[PDB]
Every structure is written in C-alpha cells, then in structure tokens.
Design a protein around this ligand. Structure first.
Ligand SMILES: [Hg+2]
Ligand SMILES: [Hg+2]
Lengths: 6, 279
C-alpha cells in the first residue's frame, strides 16, 4: 500500500 | 473542463509536464461508472462526495471510517474538489479497522464480495475496485485479486511503501491486476515507493491533498495515495468509451507519459498516468 504523512 | 489551482496530482495527470496547476478533464467525469473503495470505510456524508458515496459492506462492528485513509482515497477517486472522476459513484467496503489493519481472510472476503455485489448495481460504464493496501506475499490474496479482475472489475492496487521490490508484497505481486507506484511533484519516484518488474504504472503519491474524516481535508503521502488516481482515471476512461475493465490497465500504460520519471531502477517501467485530454 501506501499510507493513511505530509 | 478545467479545475484551476487543482491539487498537483490532479494537474500532473492531465499534463505532459510537471509544474502545472490546472486539471483539464472531460465533463463526463466518470458518470455511469462505479468504483469500490476497499479500505477503512468512507465518510459518506462528507459534502465533497455530494451524496455520490455510500457504505455497502463492513467486516467490523461499524461501517464508519474512524481512520480517515479510506475517506482520503475515495476522495482522490471522486470527490468534487480532490477527485479524478468527479461524477463517479463510490461504494465503500470496510475491510480495514480504524487502526488501518485487517486480516488477509477478511480482505479476501471483501474482494469476493465486490465480485458478486457489482451484479446488483447499475454501473452502465463499468466497475473499478481500488485497493490502497497490501502486506507480505500471500498466494491466496494474489488469487482473490485475480478472481476480482477476471469477474470483470478493473483492479488497481498499491505497490506498497517499503522502497523494495513489489514482488514480495500482495496483492501488489499479482500480475493480472494493475500495480501502481508513487511519484512526487518533481517527477521523481516517491522515496518510499516499491518498484520492480511487476509495477504497471506510476501516479502521484507524495503529499496528496484530499478529504478526511470529520468533514475536513488532509495531505498525506503514500503509494496508497497513487492508487486511487489510477482507479479514478480508469473510471474516467471507461465512461469515455476508451477502454474496458479488462484492458484498462494496459491502455493507461500505452497512453502514459513515458520516460518522465527519475529514480526509476533498471527493470521498472517509467510510465506516469496521463489522461490525454484535448479540449
Ligand atoms: Hg487509503
Ligand atoms: Hg488517500
């Protein structure tokens, strides 16, 4: 996945 | 149509060069298509969804998104301000808990559920499923993704964030689906993005502004963020009649911006999602 930063 | 001062990822996707700020797209905007967001749920009442979103299934006590990631990704797929396919229908499937985790068997069950559920939805232009999740290699998870794809749904899945070869991550390593890497606003591969021969395409994934729970917005980073861009683009192109669920991934790669990304290791495709819009 990629996330859930800035 | 054009959206002025759009989030950078939206502008990137209708531009042949980085640095623009207008998102140009066709007014049809994905209407007639449906995108299942398989994630932490969606805050359906968020105004940016204009009532085009709803919860359809949970595997937990509540169908509510107490995490935000899911609302974030649904927003990039199809919220008014932050979405690629501004008129698409969104269906939320909560396979992840409010902490963002879930078991492989419930994520497999959520995929099987969509394969069936789509049959009682009216989606004249096609059905897309967006999976901003993944974990270690599992042949059973890969397998649920391949079934969903073959049932006639365009499956878009995250490459994953370990700056590693996506081959050891699932559903990312299922070849039959569309594995999405992440890039940043300078056309570099996102530093956290997985890579490898299994990736099909890249989309904007670094510091993506989108909807958040509590009726707010937030910019987060992650290939998870890139995925919905490609899922939304697929929905957009299907309603345009350009491609089908089965060939949408290959069609996106064929019409991508080629060779624009930097920091792509030998073996990984250098293709960036591109809508090819012409007024
Ligand atoms: Hg997400
Ligand atoms: Hg997101």
């Amino acid at each position: 996945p990629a996330p859930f930063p800035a | 149509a054009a959206q002025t001062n759009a989030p950078w990822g939206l502008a990137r996707i209708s531009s042949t060069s980085p640095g623009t700020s207008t998102y140009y797209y066709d007014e049809s905007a994905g209407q007639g298509s449906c995108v299942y967001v398989i994630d932490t749920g969606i805050e359906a009442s968020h105004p940016e969804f204009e009532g085009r979103a709803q919860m359809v299934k949970t595997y937990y006590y509540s169908s509510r998104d107490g995490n935000g990631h899911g609302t974030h990704c649904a927003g990039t797929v199809g919220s008014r301000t932050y979405g690629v396919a501004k008129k698409t229908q969104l269906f939320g499937v909560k396979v992840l808990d409010d902490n963002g985790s879930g078991q492989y068997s419930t994520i497999i069950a959520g995929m099987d559920f969509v394969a069936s559920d789509k049959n009682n939805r009216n989606c004249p232009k096609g059905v897309v499923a967006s999976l901003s999740l993944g974990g270690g290699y599992s042949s059973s998870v890969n397998s649920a993704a391949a079934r969903l794809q073959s049932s006639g749904v365009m499956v878009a899945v995250a490459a994953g964030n370990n700056n590693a070869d996506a081959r050891n991550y699932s559903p990312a390593s299922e070849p039959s689906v569309c594995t999405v890497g992440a890039s940043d606003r300078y056309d570099r591969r996102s530093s956290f993005s997985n890579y490898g021969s299994v990736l099909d395409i890249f989309g904007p994934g670094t510091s993506i502004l989108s909807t958040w729970i509590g009726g707010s917005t937030r910019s987060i980073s992650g290939t998870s963020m890139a995925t919905p861009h490609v899922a939304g683009l697929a929905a957009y192109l299907m309603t345009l009649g350009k491609t089908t669920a089965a060939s949408a991934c290959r069609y996106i790669a064929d019409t991508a911006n080629k060779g624009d990304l930097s920091n792509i290791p030998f073996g990984t495709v250098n293709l960036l999602a591109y809508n090819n819009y012409q007024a």
